[PDB]
Design a binder for these strands. Structure first.
Length: 81
RNA sequence: GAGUAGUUCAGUGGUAGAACACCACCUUGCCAAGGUGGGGGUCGCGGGUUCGAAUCCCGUCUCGGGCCCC
RNA sequence: GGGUGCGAUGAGAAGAAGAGUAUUAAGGAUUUACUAUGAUUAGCGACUCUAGGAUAGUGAAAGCUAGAGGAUAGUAACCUUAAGAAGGCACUUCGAGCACCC
């Protein structure tokens, strides 16, 4: 849901920072794009499902970053609430 | 008068010269700066004089100006 | 206050790379390349010898293409200690402002 990501309060952008955010479990929601490389996505969804946190899948990574405030797209972005 | 290396400029009969640009190495993440060298040119064109012509001379092309010249 | 670039495809900042590296200053060894230079006298013009290539004058020996081989001085590449940098991206952290103009 791009709406949940364009909204909320505390958010973190980029795969590396989201898995690093998963290493402290201070994250409420995880949002991952489908069109992104699975080599980068599986690595985060594995830990995300392992932790017991909800995992979402969205179509484009570009509109994701656009929803995050980015001028890009992000392969994966976590709302840490 | 003005024409010359890709570009901008020197060179008053004697090696075709600079500075940018270009390429290569110094540079095993990639660029930039720097250093080191490498090369490239119908000297507008064709003659003549000459040992030797970018230079002098003859013709001629392009171009700016002037009243053949510059 | 006010014209013009862009910015979570990461502005900006710190840290870590870069690294005792480029470099500067003294140094051993004599190491090959590299640039520069070749008494006097004729001459515009000469490091030396070749294979020719070209020659009018000058000259003991000329400009040209391929090579070889020299003295000398430098700058480099091999090492020895003494000093010690830098922009962008990627990495890590922090996160929306930064830079051109009057």
């Amino acid at each position: 849901s791009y709406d949940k990501v364009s909204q909320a309060k505390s958010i973190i952008i980029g795969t590396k920072q989201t898995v690093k955010a998963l290493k402290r479990g201070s994250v409420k929601e995880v949002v991952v794009a489908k069109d992104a490389d699975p080599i980068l996505t599986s690595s985060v969804v594995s830990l995300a499902e392992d932790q017991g946190i909800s995992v979402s899948m969205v179509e484009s990574m570009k509109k994701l970053g656009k929803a995050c405030g980015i001028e890009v797209g992000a392969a994966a972005v976590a709302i840490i609430l």
